[PDB]
Write an enzyme that holds these catalytic residues in place. Structure first.
Site, PDB file in Angstrom:
ATOM      1  N   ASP A 160       0.815  -1.207   0.000  1.00  0.00           N
ATOM      2  CA  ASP A 160       0.000   0.000   0.000  1.00  0.00           C
ATOM      3  C   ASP A 160       0.860   1.273   0.000  1.00  0.00           C
ATOM      4  N   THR A 168      -7.124   3.130  -2.082  1.00  0.00           N
ATOM      5  CA  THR A 168      -6.706   1.776  -1.793  1.00  0.00           C
ATOM      6  C   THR A 168      -7.657   0.736  -2.324  1.00  0.00           C
ATOM      7  N   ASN A 183     -13.593   5.458  -1.237  1.00  0.00           N
ATOM      8  CA  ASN A 183     -13.452   4.806   0.055  1.00  0.00           C
ATOM      9  C   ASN A 183     -14.701   5.115   0.880  1.00  0.00           C
ATOM     10  N   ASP A 241       2.160   3.188   3.025  1.00  0.00           N
ATOM     11  CA  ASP A 241       1.093   4.150   3.051  1.00  0.00           C
ATOM     12  C   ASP A 241       0.956   4.684   4.490  1.00  0.00           C
ATOM     13  N   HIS A 279       1.280   8.839   5.030  1.00  0.00           N
ATOM     14  CA  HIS A 279       0.295   9.818   5.378  1.00  0.00           C
ATOM     15  C   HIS A 279       0.818  10.735   6.499  1.00  0.00           C
ATOM     16  N   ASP A 285      -0.595  -0.344  -4.964  1.00  0.00           N
ATOM     17  CA  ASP A 285      -1.935   0.089  -5.322  1.00  0.00           C
ATOM     18  C   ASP A 285      -1.964   1.550  -5.844  1.00  0.00           C
ATOM     19  N   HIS A 303      -3.304  10.660  -1.113  1.00  0.00           N
ATOM     20  CA  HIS A 303      -3.392  10.161  -2.469  1.00  0.00           C
ATOM     21  C   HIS A 303      -4.865  10.148  -2.799  1.00  0.00           C
ATOM     22  N   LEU A 353     -18.900   3.376 -24.266  1.00  0.00           N
ATOM     23  CA  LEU A 353     -19.131   2.498 -25.413  1.00  0.00           C
ATOM     24  C   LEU A 353     -19.999   3.200 -26.451  1.00  0.00           C
TER      25      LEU A 353
HETATM   26  C1  LIG Z   1     -15.258  -2.922 -18.820  1.00  0.00           C
HETATM   27  O1  LIG Z   1     -15.536  -4.323 -18.768  1.00  0.00           O
HETATM   28  C2  LIG Z   1     -16.840  -4.644 -18.263  1.00  0.00           C
HETATM   29  C3  LIG Z   1     -16.947  -6.152 -18.179  1.00  0.00           C
HETATM   30  O2  LIG Z   1     -16.872  -6.804 -19.515  1.00  0.00           O
HETATM   31  C4  LIG Z   1     -17.861  -4.049 -19.236  1.00  0.00           C
HETATM   32  O3  LIG Z   1     -19.141  -4.167 -18.591  1.00  0.00           O
HETATM   33  C5  LIG Z   1     -20.086  -5.052 -19.104  1.00  0.00           C
HETATM   34  O4  LIG Z   1     -20.784  -4.337 -20.127  1.00  0.00           O
HETATM   35  C6  LIG Z   1     -21.984  -4.892 -20.741  1.00  0.00           C
HETATM   36  C7  LIG Z   1     -22.735  -3.692 -21.505  1.00  0.00           C
HETATM   37  O5  LIG Z   1     -22.910  -2.355 -20.690  1.00  0.00           O
HETATM   38  C8  LIG Z   1     -22.897  -5.530 -19.669  1.00  0.00           C
HETATM   39  O6  LIG Z   1     -23.897  -6.396 -20.283  1.00  0.00           O
HETATM   40  C9  LIG Z   1     -25.149  -6.160 -19.670  1.00  0.00           C
HETATM   41  O7  LIG Z   1     -25.404  -7.161 -18.676  1.00  0.00           O
HETATM   42  C10 LIG Z   1     -26.694  -7.128 -18.047  1.00  0.00           C
HETATM   43  C11 LIG Z   1     -26.676  -8.238 -17.012  1.00  0.00           C
HETATM   44  O8  LIG Z   1     -25.833  -7.823 -15.915  1.00  0.00           O
HETATM   45  C12 LIG Z   1     -25.815  -8.529 -14.691  1.00  0.00           C
HETATM   46  O9  LIG Z   1     -25.073  -9.756 -14.738  1.00  0.00           O
HETATM   47  C13 LIG Z   1     -23.642  -9.664 -15.063  1.00  0.00           C
HETATM   48  C14 LIG Z   1     -23.079 -11.097 -15.223  1.00  0.00           C
HETATM   49  O10 LIG Z   1     -22.621 -11.820 -13.990  1.00  0.00           O
HETATM   50  C15 LIG Z   1     -22.208 -13.153 -14.225  1.00  0.00           C
HETATM   51  O11 LIG Z   1     -21.025 -13.196 -15.055  1.00  0.00           O
HETATM   52  C16 LIG Z   1     -20.542 -14.541 -15.391  1.00  0.00           C
HETATM   53  C17 LIG Z   1     -20.419 -14.591 -16.913  1.00  0.00           C
HETATM   54  O12 LIG Z   1     -19.697 -13.443 -17.494  1.00  0.00           O
HETATM   55  C18 LIG Z   1     -21.481 -15.645 -14.763  1.00  0.00           C
HETATM   56  O13 LIG Z   1     -20.943 -16.935 -15.048  1.00  0.00           O
HETATM   57  C19 LIG Z   1     -21.617 -15.437 -13.235  1.00  0.00           C
HETATM   58  O14 LIG Z   1     -22.631 -16.304 -12.690  1.00  0.00           O
HETATM   59  C20 LIG Z   1     -21.871 -13.924 -12.914  1.00  0.00           C
HETATM   60  O15 LIG Z   1     -22.875 -13.737 -11.923  1.00  0.00           O
HETATM   61  C21 LIG Z   1     -22.938  -8.779 -13.977  1.00  0.00           C
HETATM   62  O16 LIG Z   1     -21.561  -8.567 -14.306  1.00  0.00           O
HETATM   63  C22 LIG Z   1     -23.639  -7.414 -13.849  1.00  0.00           C
HETATM   64  O17 LIG Z   1     -22.999  -6.620 -12.819  1.00  0.00           O
HETATM   65  C23 LIG Z   1     -23.257  -5.238 -12.785  1.00  0.00           C
HETATM   66  O18 LIG Z   1     -24.377  -4.927 -11.952  1.00  0.00           O
HETATM   67  C24 LIG Z   1     -24.207  -5.310 -10.519  1.00  0.00           C
HETATM   68  C25 LIG Z   1     -25.446  -4.798  -9.821  1.00  0.00           C
HETATM   69  O19 LIG Z   1     -26.578  -5.253 -10.547  1.00  0.00           O
HETATM   70  C26 LIG Z   1     -22.895  -4.745  -9.864  1.00  0.00           C
HETATM   71  O20 LIG Z   1     -22.629  -5.375  -8.583  1.00  0.00           O
HETATM   72  C27 LIG Z   1     -21.673  -4.860 -10.796  1.00  0.00           C
HETATM   73  O21 LIG Z   1     -20.626  -4.000 -10.240  1.00  0.00           O
HETATM   74  C28 LIG Z   1     -22.050  -4.435 -12.267  1.00  0.00           C
HETATM   75  O22 LIG Z   1     -22.293  -3.002 -12.347  1.00  0.00           O
HETATM   76  C29 LIG Z   1     -21.859  -2.280 -13.468  1.00  0.00           C
HETATM   77  O23 LIG Z   1     -22.564  -2.640 -14.718  1.00  0.00           O
HETATM   78  C30 LIG Z   1     -24.012  -2.263 -14.789  1.00  0.00           C
HETATM   79  C31 LIG Z   1     -24.567  -2.766 -16.119  1.00  0.00           C
HETATM   80  O24 LIG Z   1     -24.656  -4.207 -16.013  1.00  0.00           O
HETATM   81  C32 LIG Z   1     -24.217  -0.765 -14.573  1.00  0.00           C
HETATM   82  O25 LIG Z   1     -25.608  -0.584 -14.371  1.00  0.00           O
HETATM   83  C33 LIG Z   1     -23.435  -0.233 -13.355  1.00  0.00           C
HETATM   84  O26 LIG Z   1     -23.364   1.176 -13.399  1.00  0.00           O
HETATM   85  C34 LIG Z   1     -21.966  -0.744 -13.239  1.00  0.00           C
HETATM   86  O27 LIG Z   1     -21.146  -0.029 -14.197  1.00  0.00           O
HETATM   87  C35 LIG Z   1     -25.179  -7.627 -13.626  1.00  0.00           C
HETATM   88  O28 LIG Z   1     -25.417  -8.202 -12.346  1.00  0.00           O
HETATM   89  C36 LIG Z   1     -27.793  -7.279 -19.109  1.00  0.00           C
HETATM   90  O29 LIG Z   1     -28.988  -7.169 -18.344  1.00  0.00           O
HETATM   91  C37 LIG Z   1     -27.683  -6.190 -20.206  1.00  0.00           C
HETATM   92  O30 LIG Z   1     -28.647  -6.377 -21.292  1.00  0.00           O
HETATM   93  C38 LIG Z   1     -29.566  -5.406 -21.766  1.00  0.00           C
HETATM   94  O31 LIG Z   1     -29.008  -4.800 -22.945  1.00  0.00           O
HETATM   95  C39 LIG Z   1     -29.144  -5.576 -24.197  1.00  0.00           C
HETATM   96  C40 LIG Z   1     -28.432  -4.828 -25.297  1.00  0.00           C
HETATM   97  O32 LIG Z   1     -28.200  -5.713 -26.406  1.00  0.00           O
HETATM   98  C41 LIG Z   1     -30.617  -5.795 -24.554  1.00  0.00           C
HETATM   99  O33 LIG Z   1     -30.762  -6.499 -25.796  1.00  0.00           O
HETATM  100  C42 LIG Z   1     -31.273  -6.574 -23.446  1.00  0.00           C
HETATM  101  O34 LIG Z   1     -32.677  -6.632 -23.766  1.00  0.00           O
HETATM  102  C43 LIG Z   1     -31.016  -5.907 -22.057  1.00  0.00           C
HETATM  103  O35 LIG Z   1     -32.020  -4.873 -22.003  1.00  0.00           O
HETATM  104  C44 LIG Z   1     -32.920  -4.684 -20.944  1.00  0.00           C
HETATM  105  O36 LIG Z   1     -32.358  -3.768 -19.950  1.00  0.00           O
HETATM  106  C45 LIG Z   1     -32.163  -2.380 -20.409  1.00  0.00           C
HETATM  107  C46 LIG Z   1     -31.331  -1.614 -19.374  1.00  0.00           C
HETATM  108  O37 LIG Z   1     -31.631  -1.998 -18.015  1.00  0.00           O
HETATM  109  C47 LIG Z   1     -33.575  -1.814 -20.715  1.00  0.00           C
HETATM  110  O38 LIG Z   1     -33.547  -0.472 -21.170  1.00  0.00           O
HETATM  111  C48 LIG Z   1     -34.209  -2.627 -21.843  1.00  0.00           C
HETATM  112  O39 LIG Z   1     -35.401  -1.907 -22.266  1.00  0.00           O
HETATM  113  C49 LIG Z   1     -34.311  -4.161 -21.402  1.00  0.00           C
HETATM  114  O40 LIG Z   1     -35.233  -4.513 -20.333  1.00  0.00           O
HETATM  115  C50 LIG Z   1     -26.219  -6.168 -20.751  1.00  0.00           C
HETATM  116  O41 LIG Z   1     -25.860  -7.284 -21.546  1.00  0.00           O
HETATM  117  C51 LIG Z   1     -22.165  -6.257 -18.524  1.00  0.00           C
HETATM  118  O42 LIG Z   1     -23.012  -6.415 -17.387  1.00  0.00           O
HETATM  119  C52 LIG Z   1     -21.019  -5.410 -17.955  1.00  0.00           C
HETATM  120  N1  LIG Z   1     -20.329  -6.004 -16.817  1.00  0.00           N
HETATM  121  C53 LIG Z   1     -19.803  -5.475 -15.689  1.00  0.00           C
HETATM  122  C54 LIG Z   1     -19.105  -6.420 -14.722  1.00  0.00           C
HETATM  123  O43 LIG Z   1     -19.829  -4.274 -15.419  1.00  0.00           O
HETATM  124  C55 LIG Z   1     -17.634  -2.580 -19.486  1.00  0.00           C
HETATM  125  O44 LIG Z   1     -18.526  -2.200 -20.500  1.00  0.00           O
HETATM  126  C56 LIG Z   1     -16.182  -2.248 -19.809  1.00  0.00           C
HETATM  127  N2  LIG Z   1     -15.945  -0.853 -19.956  1.00  0.00           N
HETATM  128  C57 LIG Z   1     -15.440  -0.311 -21.097  1.00  0.00           C
HETATM  129  C58 LIG Z   1     -15.344   1.181 -21.122  1.00  0.00           C
HETATM  130  O45 LIG Z   1     -15.132  -1.023 -22.083  1.00  0.00           O
HETATM  131 CA   LIG Z   2     -22.637   4.862 -24.865  1.00  0.00          CA
HETATM  132 ZN   LIG Z   3      -3.465   5.885   2.207  1.00  0.00          ZN
END
Ligand SMILES: *[C@@H]1O[C@H](CO)[C@@H](O[C@@H]2O[C@H](CO)[C@@H](O[C@@H]3O[C@H](CO[C@H]4O[C@H](CO[C@H]5O[C@H](CO)[C@@H](O)[C@H](O)[C@@H]5O)[C@@H](O)[C@H](O[C@H]5O[C@H](CO)[C@@H](O)[C@H](O)[C@@H]5O[C@H]5O[C@H](CO)[C@@H](O)[C@H](O)[C@@H]5O)[C@@H]4O)[C@@H](O)[C@H](O[C@H]4O[C@H](CO)[C@@H](O)[C@H](O)[C@@H]4O[C@H]4O[C@H](CO)[C@@H](O)[C@H](O)[C@@H]4O)[C@@H]3O)[C@H](O)[C@H]2NC(C)=O)[C@H](O)[C@H]1NC(C)=O
Ligand SMILES: [Ca+2]
Ligand SMILES: [Zn+2]
Ligand SMILES: N#Cc1cc(Cl)cc(COC(=O)N2C[C@@H]3CN(C(=O)c4ccc5[nH]nnc5c4)C[C@@H]3C2)c1
Ligand code: NA
Ligand code: NA
Length: 806
Positions: A121, A159, A180, A261, A265, A308, A420, A689
């Protein structure tokens, strides 16, 4: 309730955390207070200290001792780390010469070289050189192994955001640990450093390495250590785990040091008091390596030494107060310190106005040491917006400063000389990376890279398939002697059309005019050649970008530039051109100031029109290929084609015109030519995106012409600047940016001055990786070069930071 009446007998630092209310014996029970009554007596033995002395050699086993020096201690896996040195005439690992580790040299029953992640750290990158005299074990790892001059953390440089990025390969916005201190409005719950809410699973998103490992049948050491477990015990625990039977022994382990760390501090990064914490860390490294060597594991394990974040000089006197700017300070909640986040104190107060809070905080004092931003306006390189735990209002604090709500918060809430959390480009926030082991290269320096990339590589080191993350798998293959990941370029989804002349000028009714009706087999066979792609090898140096989504677009050739023209968005996705060192800047001739010319290769219905701009009093237009850089008076007409025009606020046209009229040529002079690709970006939901068309929130009034949220440029040249950009035989050099497309220059406090005093500084602030532009456009660049694909991946992750040399 934890009924702590069970016992840790035989279970000390057990690897499965058993469910309540049975009492726990793992390396976190102290932090949850759930340890059995006898955890200290059996699991935290301290008697006789941590080092063998001559008189203990041979001793009779005494189970009370912290570690052992008896003949059987190797069988038991619980010798003191210096046992062989003291008692068997062995050398310390640090005193041995380094000898290349060409293949793993593992004991029988090891299926793969174990990975040990040694995380520190607050270990600032410059400690490697500035502390070198007092860190011999670390210096040996660094010189014998693979090292970077520094490793870039994520923002915010706190961190937990950074450790959990290291474990997940995700940006904080995506993993969900965004600071944090946090409020999540959906859960209606707060997360804090002290406390017990932070132990709830719903905070932590993604898939960390220990879970990736477990789901693929690789066992993991528990990554977290309670603060009261001493460092010596942490190391002995790791080494005892490494003696387990094959079916029970983990393949991956972590150690964590709260130093330097903790001292940083209190004393600042280079306080005289900081020597001793560096010495102590080095000694702990030394204990690990002597321990591994005792177990015959020193040419078997891959060790990563990683920090970190760094540490900067920060004192109480360099605090700005929001009470010196706002009158309604009691109506806000500030998350304070090296960044700010502001939200309303109460959701039932409909008088709170974000716009007026930002206006009250913008450029209000000459030396102001923070800048407010709506989160979506932060530099894209920060990837700090798409999470509901990130408040809309953000303050980016200057290095060496804090922000606080009111003075009383600082004198009744100086104690500290280091902190930091600042912008992750700042030099003092950078941290360290060393890899040592059979899988890493020998005596190799690599370029700086970002910590988001390490998950993929840890997965590689363990034979695991990484979960979907924000690293670019393959960009860090140059760190590895073997286990490389050999990616293929993504497939192009949409192929281009190549339209010829298809429309007469009178078909167009776009409200556009140009003074161009002032007209020869010599130079008219010549312009036909330029429209079929005859100069294209000069202006498209690395192949056409691939379009990785489904859409309709046209490739348009011209003397001085090539473009991919979207029929859906009515403007280029990309425009490519090369400017040699010798090129000359010319001005826009007076009679052509408002010239826009129909493009007879593209239908009227897939063209912009001038009238929409005339009737939209807020919106003007610019060109992607700049008229200033035209190769000839006649070629200049191409630049005024309606297919080269893009919507631009007048305030943004000040920036863009200066970039195009002055900067491009300056870069070509300095870099011995440049290739430029520029285009628009639409990211209205701030997720980093490419937007689909139905996500666009703003169009040029009356029209279907979508307004970009950002404009990009990728500027490529030869790394060996004695070769010109268009005849480069080896590696490339790139810088890029993603400029926000804003209707005011409120971000730039010096914008009433001449562009030469503010524009380039804005552009530097919004420096970007090519990969960032890829995500934002659905385009794939550098598809045809003579370089290895891995080398291209590394070039695409490069960020030009504009800091001085560390
Ligand atoms: C950096 O990398 C990351 C990782 O690759 C990129 O993030 C990914 O980006 C994708 C597009 O934005 C996104 O796809 C989503 O997924 C939705 C489902 O999400 C839930 O499940 C995820 C999977 O978990 C499982 O993973 C493995 C397999 O991979 C399994 O084996 C395990 O069993 C796991 O459980 C999960 O990751 C995700 O976590 C997020 O949400 C949690 C709380 O709910 C948080 O704890 C966690 O931190 C995550 O939070 C972030 O992401 C969410 C968005 O998911 C965001 O809100 C937060 O701010 C935060 O940033 C979930 O638990 C799926 O529902 C989505 O599909 C919709 O869109 C498609 C488009 O084609 C439609 O066709 C479809 O119909 C659907 O639409 C419906 O919903 C719309 C909006 O709600 C609605 O308007 C519409 O009308 C419909 O009803 C979509 O596929 C990935 O989830 C995401 N992953 C992560 C980890 O963040 C990221 O983009 C990269 N960044 C850059 C800049 O490149
Ligand atoms: Ca966008
Ligand atoms: Zn510190
Ligand atoms: N991620 C990650 C990661 C990546 C790498 Cl490279 C190294 C490490 C090693 O970090 C630790 O030893 N730490 C021990 C410290 C105190 N502490 C807690 O008590 C705690 C925090 C969150 C929890 N969630 N569930 N239980 C939890 C307990 C967290 C701090 C950091 C972690
Ligand atoms: Na005109
Ligand atoms: Na301004």
């Amino acid at each position: 309730w934890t009924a702590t009446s069970g016992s840790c007998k035989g279970r000390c630092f057990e690897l499965q955390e058993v469910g309540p209310p049975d009492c726990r014996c793992d390396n976190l029970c102290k932090s949850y207070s759930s340890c059995c009554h006898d955890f200290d007596e059996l699991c935290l033995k301290t008697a006789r200290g941590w080092e063998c002395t001559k008189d203990r050699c041979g001793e009779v086993r005494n189970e009370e001792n912290a570690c052992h020096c008896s003949e059987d201690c190797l069988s038991r896996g619980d010798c003191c780390t210096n046992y062989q040195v003291v008692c068997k005439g062995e050398s310390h690992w640090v005193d041995d010469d380094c000898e290349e580790i060409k293949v793993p040299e593992c004991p029988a029953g090891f299926v793969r070289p174990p990975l040990i992640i040694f995380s520190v750290d607050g270990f600032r990158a410059s400690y490697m050189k500035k502390g070198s005299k007092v860190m011999p074990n670390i210096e040996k790892l660094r010189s014998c192994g693979t090292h970077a001059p520094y490793m870039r953390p994520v923002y915010p440089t706190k961190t937990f955001p950074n450790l959990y990025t290291l474990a997940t390969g995700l940006y904080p916005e995506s993993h969900g640990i965004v600071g944090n201190s946090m409020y999540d409005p959906v859960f209606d719950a707060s997360f804090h450093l002290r406390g017990r809410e932070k132990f709830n699973h719903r905070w932590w998103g993604g898939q960390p390495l220990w879970i990736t490992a477990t789901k693929q049948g690789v066992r993991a050491g528990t990554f977290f250590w309670s603060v009261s477990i001493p460092h010596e015990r942490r190391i002995l625990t790791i080494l005892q785990w490494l003696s387990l039977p094959d079916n029970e022994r983990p393949s991956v382990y972590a150690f964590y040091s709260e130093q330097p760390d903790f001292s940083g501090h209190k004393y600042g990064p280079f306080g005289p008091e900081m020597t001793n914490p560096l010495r102590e860390i080095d000694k702990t490294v030394g204990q690990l390596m002597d321990g591994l060597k005792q177990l015959r594991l020193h040419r078997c394990v891959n060790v990563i030494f990683v920090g970190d974040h760094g540490m900067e000089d920060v004192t109480c006197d360099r605090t700005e107060f929001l009470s010196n700017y706002l009158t309604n300070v009691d109506d806000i909640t500030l998350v304070p310190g090296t960044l700010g986040r502001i939200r309303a104190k109460s959701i039932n107060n409909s008088k709170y106005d974000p716009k007026t809070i930002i206006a009250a905080l913008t450029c209000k004092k000459p030396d102001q040491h923070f800048k407010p931003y709506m989160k979506q306006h932060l530099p894209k390189r920060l990837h700090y917006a798409n999470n509901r735990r990130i408040e809309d209002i953000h303050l980016l604090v200057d290095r060496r400063w804090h922000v606080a709500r009111k003075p009383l918060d600082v004198y009744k809430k100086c104690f500290f000389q280091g902190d930091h959390g600042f912008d992750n480009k700042v030099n003092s926030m950078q941290t360290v990376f060393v890899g040592y082991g059979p899988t890493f290269k020998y005596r190799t320096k690599v370029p700086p890279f970002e910590n988001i990339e390490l998950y993929n590589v840890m997965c590689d080191l363990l034979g695991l398939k990484p979960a979907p993350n924000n690293g670019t798998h393959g960009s860090l293959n140059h760190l590895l002697r073997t286990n490389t990941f050999r990616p293929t370029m993504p497939d192009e989804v949409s192929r281009p059309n190549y339209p010829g002349i298809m429309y007469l000028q009178s078909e167009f009714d776009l409200g556009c005019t140009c003074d161009d009706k002032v007209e020869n087999k010599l130079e008219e066979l010549n312009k036909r050649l330029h429209t079929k792609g005859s100069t294209k090898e000069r202006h498209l140096l690395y192949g056409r970008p691939a379009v990785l989504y489904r859409t309709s677009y046209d490739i348009l050739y011209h003397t001085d530039f090539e473009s991919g023209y979207s029929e859906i968005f009515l403007m280029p996705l990309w425009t490519s051109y090369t400017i040699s060192k010798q090129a000359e800047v010319s001005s826009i001739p007076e009679h052509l100031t408002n010239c826009v010319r129909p493009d007879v290769r593209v239908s009227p219905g897939f063209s912009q029109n001038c009238l929409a701009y005339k009737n939209d009093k807020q919106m003007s237009y610019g060109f992607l290929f700049p008229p200033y850089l035209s190769s000839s008076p006649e070629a200049k007409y191409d630049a005024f084609l309606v297919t080269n025009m893009v919507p631009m606020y007048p305030a943004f046209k000040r920036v863009w015109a200066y970039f195009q009229r002055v900067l491009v040529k300056k870069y070509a002079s300095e870099r011995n030519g440049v290739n430029v690709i520029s285009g628009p970006i639409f990211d209205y939901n701030y997720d980093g995106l490419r937007d689909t068309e139905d996500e666009i929130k703003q169009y040029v009034e009356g029209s279907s012409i979508p307004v970009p949220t950002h404009y990009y440029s990728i500027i490529t040249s030869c790394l060996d600047f004695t070769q010109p950009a268009d005849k480069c035989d080896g590696p490339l050099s790139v810088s890029s940016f993603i400029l926000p497309h804003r209707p005011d220059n409120d971000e730039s406090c010096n914008s009433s001055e001449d562009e030469s005093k503010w524009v380039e500084e804005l552009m530097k602030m919004h420096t970007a990786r090519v990969r960032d532009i890829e995500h934002l456009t659905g385009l794939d660049f550098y598809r045809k070069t003579s370089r290895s694909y891995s080398e291209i991946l590394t070039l695409k992750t490069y960020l030009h930071t504009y800091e001085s040399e560390i």
